Amino acid sequence: MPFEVVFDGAKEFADLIATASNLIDEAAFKFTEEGISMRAMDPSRVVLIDLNLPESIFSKYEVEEPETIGINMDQFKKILKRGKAKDTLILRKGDENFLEITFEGTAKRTFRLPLIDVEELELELPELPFTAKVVLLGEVLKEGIKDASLVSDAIKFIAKENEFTMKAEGETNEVEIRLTLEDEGLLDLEVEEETKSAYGIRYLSDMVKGIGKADEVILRFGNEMPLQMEYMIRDEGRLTFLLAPRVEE
Amino acid sequence: PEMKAYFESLQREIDRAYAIARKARAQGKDPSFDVEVPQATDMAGRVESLVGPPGVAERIRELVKEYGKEIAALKVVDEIIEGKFGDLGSKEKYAEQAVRTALAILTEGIVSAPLEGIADVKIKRNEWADGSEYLALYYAGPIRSSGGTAQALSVLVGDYVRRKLGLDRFKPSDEHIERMVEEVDLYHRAVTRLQYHPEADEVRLAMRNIPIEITGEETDKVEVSHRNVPGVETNHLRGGAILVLAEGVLQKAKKLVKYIDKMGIEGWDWIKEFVEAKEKGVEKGFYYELYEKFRANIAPNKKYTKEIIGGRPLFAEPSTNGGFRLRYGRSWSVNPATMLILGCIVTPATTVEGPIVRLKNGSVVRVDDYETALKVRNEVDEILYVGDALVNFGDFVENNQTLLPANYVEEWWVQELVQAIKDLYEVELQPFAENDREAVEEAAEYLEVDPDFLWNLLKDPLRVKPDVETAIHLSTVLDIPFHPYYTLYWNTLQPEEVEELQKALLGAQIEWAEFRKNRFAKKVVLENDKNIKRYLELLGLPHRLERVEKKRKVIVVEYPWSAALLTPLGNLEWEFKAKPFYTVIDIINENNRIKLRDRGISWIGKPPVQVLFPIGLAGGQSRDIKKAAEEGKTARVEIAFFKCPKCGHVGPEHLCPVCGTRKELLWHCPKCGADYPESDAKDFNYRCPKCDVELKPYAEREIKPADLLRQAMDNVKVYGIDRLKGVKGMTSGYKMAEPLEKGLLRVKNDVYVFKDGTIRFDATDAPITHFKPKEIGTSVEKLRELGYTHDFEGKPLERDDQILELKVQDVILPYEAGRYLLKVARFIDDLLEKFYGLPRFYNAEKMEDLVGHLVIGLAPHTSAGIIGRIIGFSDVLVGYAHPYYHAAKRRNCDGDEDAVMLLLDALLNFSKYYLPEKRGGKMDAPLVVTTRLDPREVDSEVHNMDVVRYYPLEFYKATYELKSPKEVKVIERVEDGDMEEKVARQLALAERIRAVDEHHVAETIINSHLVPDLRGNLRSFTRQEFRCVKCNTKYRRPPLTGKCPKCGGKIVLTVSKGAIEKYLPTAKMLVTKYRVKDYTRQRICITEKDIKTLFEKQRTLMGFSADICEKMVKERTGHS
DNA sequence: TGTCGTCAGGATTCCAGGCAGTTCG
DNA sequence: CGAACTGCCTGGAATCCTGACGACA
Ligand SMILES: [Zn+2]
Ligand SMILES: [Zn+2]
């Protein structure tokens, strides 16, 4: 139960947990000898967020025993609003339900909070054949989704051999973006067959606005199977969103 | 005595305030030159100010004070009809005035029903059958809640004036009775819920019995099946007349037969018919006979059944019966400990004991005071008892309410004890107070008790509770019943189960202690596994729990709580046996030389407009005068303009600010183009030769408030304003002006206001039997300089904790009301220093300075304002009142709270022109102040004073004999959004579950709310009435035309789907927690309705959404 | 006459990219 | 002699208390 994690500057982790809170409120961080893990489902059982951070991310990391703790997303969002980019985040926990967040600098800050428990059921996602993989930049996808957000909500991604297309249909508007290997927004392609699927972009737009511009993304999808967008944190941690498309035309 | 001098000082201060107001109004900056709110001399003055005539006060006083109010009013109406003081018009006007005066006299002049609610009364003839008569009673708005008593009295006076005029009996036609019963059933089924469900035969008998027909007015736009009925001008619904007749005859039978016996008129035996129709409903122990009497008493069962009309039904606690305590008091109150540990009207009583519950630790404890209540108000496990709330006997309850079974109380117990010792040892004493030295000394010598202890016991038996040892010691001499406060509730157990209780007690550990030849005990240690703990916990006894004692569940009961259970059993000496038709107390009294009694037997159960500035559509929706001045737009209003004889300026203001005089009012014909002053209007008989229309002072024209605002700006001289809007519609007939300077001052003060025209703020009070300076926050020297020199018993005032009688002119008023009154006084002093330059009379600038002045209270349906003095305050969000300041007409008047106001506020901002022409709100207007309520000064002063803290031993002994509660002789002898609501409902369900030990069923009001919600939702969806956003008046048709042709924007629609979407989870959680039938169909129907109205478009490979609805649907599918 | 939902609306603070001042081969 | 690296600061936008509306009992 007791642990201590010290890191000089955690604005990335702050905005990450802010996006997780905007996604869902009930979340439990499992602390194991390897690091931290979290898996948040959806109240409408349509979206799944997963994150893992090993012990090669923060500066100081001392854990006693692997367990599962819970932190309120509202109480955390009421905490990250004071995180300076040049601060030293220190998360301390003992045996009692007291969580300490410490910051060292021009004034020693220390906030104590109660620790409630979360009992969300965890189940391993079954393996599914992707048949479509691609690695792109985050800024291009973010600006495309922000340009196609106001016209409609169903954005259609089509992928063929060395070809990608992001389109936005409708009745009084149409948007189209082409992507090839010699373009300025595609890093690499691993397409297998001709796939095409339309997805909603509310949670998409929120989660891609929460992520910075220089970060990269890896999309895995198929014909009509759910999409998985993954990315890496400091080349050590992993974070993946997963959500199914719509059946309509 | 000195109360007359105090009232003289009060009226002297009132006259000083009146002289100040007169000196202020002497300048004449408002269209009014006389006092609008005069003080009433008596009921004669009240009725004269209500309807008059102005000068019949002498005859009214003579007749009343010489022959009684009833025949006095009868002869007064006779004289008014005969025209003794002269003539006043036609016979119809005579009848109208007589009816109004009679009703005002019998109602004491408090109700404005005959004033405005009943506008006109005419006589009309039947041109169809035989030429009989009907009263055309042109009613008005404020008559929908005229009151059942007032409606019955109006029917009585109408029949009386009909008998006086000598009219013919109307013939009830088939079409007439058909449309009457149709309107009745329509109002009962669709319009509004009724207070008394009528019957077809009953309403037919009534409509046939009424000699002359009655024709009311229009209420709503609801048609009938038989169109064009002869007699009525339309085919609308006469719901007003329906409710009038219903609450008049079908509800007020008791007062009706009382007034019948008072008057003596024939033709009313159908009320006796209705009484008859409602009248169509060796092994013998004393407690069994009492149970048989309670079973024969149908009133408690009928009340428990009728209590199902409100609140969640079928949620009664099985441990404790559905009733509170009965404390007989002259003429409800529940201990706030139960409210803190937690549905009807509430009333606080903190000076009594509380309930007893168990905590999370497993032990059982009772609630005593506020600190312990707030401490244990969160660690409760299950509610055992409800406490001991007080219901009295002086309540005016009718409809054959049977006698509630009383209880053996400590006061009655000690009274019987002292009477027994007086008749045995020949010792005189005075109970209910401190005893004399010699008497208390001889009593202490006879009873082996302390004299000071006996004094304290006689002073307060509940506070000074004797120890159980000495209690049993003194009981062994007289064989008196047991101590009630330390007597458990045993009236719900079987002797076969009591035998197992005595077996478990014998199989337990016991230690003894005796005191003064009383072989009592010292402690009992029991194991919770030795017997069924159901009744062991339902007994409601404070025990201590222990776990680490080699045994899982151990309980221990020490003194003075173990002797209270062991000594009634005789220290387990004699053997207990089970006997039917004999309660446990009966068996105990059988197998013992001491007879006991019973304890628990009583079971009874928008828009927020601020200023008056007519702008209409010229203001749009917000109607901001600052916005209008910035835009520089005109305004087409139907308003009254003025004209100055010297300057000549025209404007809707009262006084001309350019010059130093007040401008007069000009008259204009709206149809023609002529203008004439008041002199020409009164000379031309108020008729224009151009247009033959009555000369109206106001006209419809355009004005520019943008440039007209500079006048008010330079008049107020203060430009501190942030947000301020004007009125939109005018309800008055003349549509007179309003002081713009006073409106701007009110805006800068940032206070609220109603549509009445003055400043009044709501407050809630509740009278109590006593009064304490410690609680009201006033010092002894403060009361002395106020005028109090002695206590309720003649002793001087030196102690702050001096229990006193409830003073009449005292106010227990909350801090919010105090702050609002402070802001009102600030605005008042600001206006009186900026309007005329008058010195501040009150000079109030702090919270404590307001104590001493005079305010006015007013309830709905009360056209008279009760003048009270500001003596007191309050810390809690509620307050207390006086039984004279709060009467029955102020309690059952469609409102429990009352509005408070200041005298200067009324004197400065009151104007009859602020009253609508035909309709009216909850009240007409605070026309007249009243302060004299002399409660039999020279006749029954002892009756008025001696009301508190008396216990009738006679009725306490004669309560288990099925006495008649309507015994007037014995009565006189003894007298002599969503979050808060959802959380509250869930917490109420949870606490009910804790109390009933996790055993409940479904409710019915949830469906009674959902089904009408679903139907209304469907009707709104099929109607789809839209409204243009900026075009606020033009309602767009459901046929969509793209956009509003006058406003190229969106059109606001009435979706009404967000409420049901939030109510669905409530029913879902309810049906998931408890399983019930007859409603899964409704649940699946509403869910599928939402689904196919939207027609859940995305689904993953792993679904399995848990839903009890889908579970039950699949179960029914498999069963099919 | 009490309650409950929706909508827009303008005033507010928070975030981000352009204008400007500044130390590096 | 030019290029990143900040401040900062002001535009753009998300949030929200207030002001309209309708629904039931
Ligand atoms: Zn003038
Ligand atoms: Zn005219």
Please list every residue in chain B whose beta carbon sits closer than 8 Å to the beta carbon of residue A46: 1098-1100
Are B251 and B210 in contact, with CB atoms under 8 Å apart? no
Amino acid at B78: D
Helix and strand totals (H; E) in chain A: 4, 18
Any idea which residue has 């107390």 for tokens? Answer: B585
User: In whole angstroms, what is the distance from residue A110 CA to residue A11 CA?
Assistant: 17
CB B925 within 8 A of CB B863: yes
Q: Hey, what are B636's tokens?
A: 């087409």
* Cis status of the peptide bond prior to B53, with omega within 30 of 0: yes
Task: Report helix angle B69-82 to B253-263, nearest 10.
Answer: 70
Other C-beta atoms closer than 10 Å to the C-beta of B987 total 11
Q: How far apart are the first and last CA of chain B?
A: 86
- Distance, in Å, from the CA atom of A124 to the CA atom of A126, rounded to the nearest integer, reads 6
Q: What distance in angstroms lies between residue B186's CA and the mean position of ligand 1's atoms?
A: 59
In contact, B854 and B900? CB cutoff 8 Å: no
In the DSSP assignment, the letter for residue B712 is H
Distance CA B205, CA B199 (A): 10
Say whether the CB atom of B1063 is under 7 angstroms from strand C.
yes
Q: Is A202 on the interface with B (CB under 8 A)?
A: no
B544 CB closer than 7 A to any strand D atom: no
* Cα B745 to the center of its chain, rounded Å: 34
What residues 789-818 of chain B have any CB closer than 8 A to a CB of chain A? Answer: none
Question: B12-16: long-range contacts (C-beta < 8 A, 24 or more apart)?
Answer: B13/B854, B14/B39, B14/B854, B14/B867, B14/B903, B14/B931
Are A156 and A196 contacting, i.e. CB atoms less than 8 angstroms apart? Answer: yes
User: Do B1102 and A126 lie within an 8 Å CB cutoff?
Assistant: yes
Q: How far is B1083 from chain A (nearest CA, A)?
A: 20
Q: Measure B647 CA to ligand 2 centroid, in angstroms.
A: 26
Cβ-based contacts of A247 with chain B (< 8 Å)? 1097-1099
Return the bridge partners of B636, or none: B702
State whether the Cα torsion B265-B271-B276-B281 is positive or negative.
negative
CA distances from B257 to B269, B396, B568, B892, B965 (A): 10, 16, 52, 21, 18
Closest CA relative to residue B348, chosen from B809, B766, B792: B766
Count contacts between A and B (CB, < 8 Å).
24
Cα angle B454-B459-B464, degrees, rounded to a multiple of 5: 65
The crossing angle, in degrees rounded to 10, of helices B57-67 and B43-50 is 140
Mark B806-841 as b/e (b = at least 16 C-beta within 10 Å). Answer: bbbbbbbbbeebbebbbebbebbbebbebbeeeeee
Is residue A100 within 8 A of residue A3, CB to CB? The reply is: no
* C-alpha closest to that of A97 among A78, A110, A116: A116
Q: Which chain B residue is nearest to residue A124, measuring alpha carbons?
A: B1102
Q: Check residue A85 and report its DSSP letter.
A: T
Asked if B904 contacts B821 with a C-beta cutoff of 8 angstroms, the reply is no
- What tokens were used for A54? 């090993």
What is the SS3 assignment for A137-194? EHHHHHHHHHHCCCCCCEEEEEEECCEEEEEECCCCCCEEEEECCCCCCEEEEEECCC
B695 CA to centre of ligand 2 in angstroms: 7
A239 close to A39: Cβ distance less than 8 angstroms: no
Tokens of B156: 């009585």
Ligand nearest to the CA of B673: 2
A216 sits in which H/E element? strand A216-220
d(CA B43, CA B104): 9
Proximity of residue B981 CB to strand C below 7 A: yes
Name the structure determination technique: cryo-EM
Interatomic CA distance for residues B352 and B921, integer angstroms: 41
Residues of chain B contacting residue A128, judged by C-beta atoms under 8 Å apart: 1101
State how far the alpha carbon of B818 is from the alpha carbons of B293, B813, B849, in Å. 52, 7, 11
Q: What is the CA radius of gyration of chain B?
A: 36
Distance CA B394, CA B331 (A): 5
Q: How far is it, in rounded angstroms, from Cα B757 to Cα B909?
A: 7
Closest CA to A60 of A38, A92, A83: A92
Secondary structure element (H or E) that encloses residue B85, with its range: none
Gap between the Cα atoms of A245 and B806, Å rounded: 74
Burial class (CB in 10 A: 0-12, 13-18, 19+), B87: exposed
- Which is it for the CA torsion A10, A16, A21, A22, positive or negative? positive
Long-range residue pairs from B178-183, CB within 8 A, at least 24 positions apart, any chain:
B178/B226, B179/B224, B179/B226, B179/B229, B180/B207, B182/B224, B182/B225, B182/B226, B183/B224, B183/B237, B183/B238, B183/B239, B183/B242
Tell me the torsion sign for CA atoms B541, B545, B550, B552: positive
DSSP type of residue B938: T
Contacts of A127 by beta carbon, 8 Å cutoff, 6+ apart: none
Whether the CB-CB separation of A165 and A232 falls below 8 Å is answered with: no
Q: Could you tell me the distance in Å between the CA of residue A81 and the C1' of nucleotide D4? A: 29
Q: Can you give the distance from the CA of residue A131 to the C1' of nucleotide C13 in angstroms? A: 46
Residue entry with tokens 């009555």: B694
Whole-angstrom distance, CA of residue A157 vs CA of residue A177: 10
Whose CA is closest to A120, among A188, A73, A62? Answer: A73
Number of helices (H), then strands (E), in chain B: 39, 26
Cα A63 to Cα B216: distance, rounded to the nearest angstrom? 85
List the structure tokens of B456. 């304290």
Q: How far is CA B677 from the centre of its chain?
A: 50
Q: Could you tell me which residues come within 8 angstroms of residue B593 by beta carbon, excluding any fewer than 6 positions away?
A: B479
Of the candidates B711, B677, B680, the one whose C-alpha atom is nearest the C-alpha of residue B697 is B677
Instruction: Write the residues followed by a gap in chain B (C–N more than 2.5 A).
Output: 281, 331, 342, 605, 976, 1095
C chain positions with any atom within 7 Å of a protein CB: 1-9, 15, 17
Q: Is the CB of B622 under 7 A from strand D?
A: yes
Please give, one letter per residue, the 3-state secondary structure of B542-576. Answer: CCEEECCCCCCCEEEEECCCCHHHHHHHHHHCCCC
B587 in Cβ contact with B501 (< 8 Å): no
C-alpha to C-alpha distance for B47 and A67, rounded to whole angstroms: 82
- B642 CA → ligand 2 middle, Å: 18
Angle, alpha carbons B407-B408-B412 (nearest 5°): 125
Q: Does B1101 contact A at CB distance below 8 Å?
A: yes
Separation between Cα atoms, residue B35 and residue B863, nearest integer Å? 16
Q: Does the CA dihedral A90-A94-A100-A105 come out positive or negative?
A: negative
The alpha carbon of B658 and the centre of ligand 1 are apart by a number of angstroms equal to 5
Distance CA B775, CA B876 (A): 11
In angstroms, rounded to a whole number, what is the distance separating the alpha carbons of residues B1089 and B1084?
8
- Residue B667 CA, ligand 2 centroid: distance in Å: 10
Instruction: State how far the Cα of B354 lies from the Cα of B385, in Å rounded to an integer.
Output: 9
Spell out which residues of chain A touch residue B1101, defining contact as CB-CB under 8 Å.
Answer: 126, 128, 226, 244
Q: Identify which of B588, B405, B579, B625 has the alpha carbon closest to the alpha carbon of residue B487.
A: B588
A48-67 in b/e form (b: 16+ CB < 10 A) is bbbbbbbeebbeebebeeee
For residues B14 and B39, is the Cβ–Cβ distance under 8 A? yes
| Spatial CB neighbours of B249, under 8 Å, sequence gap ≥ 6 | B152, B155, B206, B256, B271
Question: Cα(B92)–Cα(B94) distance, rounded to whole angstroms?
Answer: 5
Residues whose CB falls within 8 Å of the CB of residue A89, separated by 6 or more in sequence, listed in order: A5, A6, A7, A8, A9, A10, A13, A83, A101, A102, A103
Chain B residues within 8 A of A246 when measuring between CB atoms: 1097-1098
d(CA B730, CA B639): 10
Following DSSP, what letter does each residue of A36-63 receive, concatenated?
Answer: EEEEE--TTS-EEEEEEEESSSSSEEEE
Q: Is B1094 on the interface with A (CB under 8 A)?
A: no
User: B1098 and A245 in contact by Cβ < 8 A?
Assistant: yes
How does DSSP classify residue B117? I
Residues in contact with B539: Cβ distance below 8 Å, sequence separation at least 6, in sequence order: B488, B489, B490
Can you tell me the distance from the alpha carbon of A213 to that of A139, in angstroms, rounded to the nearest whole number? Answer: 4
Pairwise CA distance, residues B991 & B999, whole Å: 12
Two structure tokens written together for B737: 């002006």
Q: State, as a whole number of angstroms, the distance between the CA of B627 and the C1' of C12.
A: 21
DSSP code for B624: B
Please return the burial class of B431, using the count of CB atoms within 10 Å of its CB with bins 0-12, 13-18 and 19+: middle
DSSP strands (E only) in B818-883: 854-858, 864-869
For strands B509-512 and B544-546, give the pairing.
Answer: unpaired
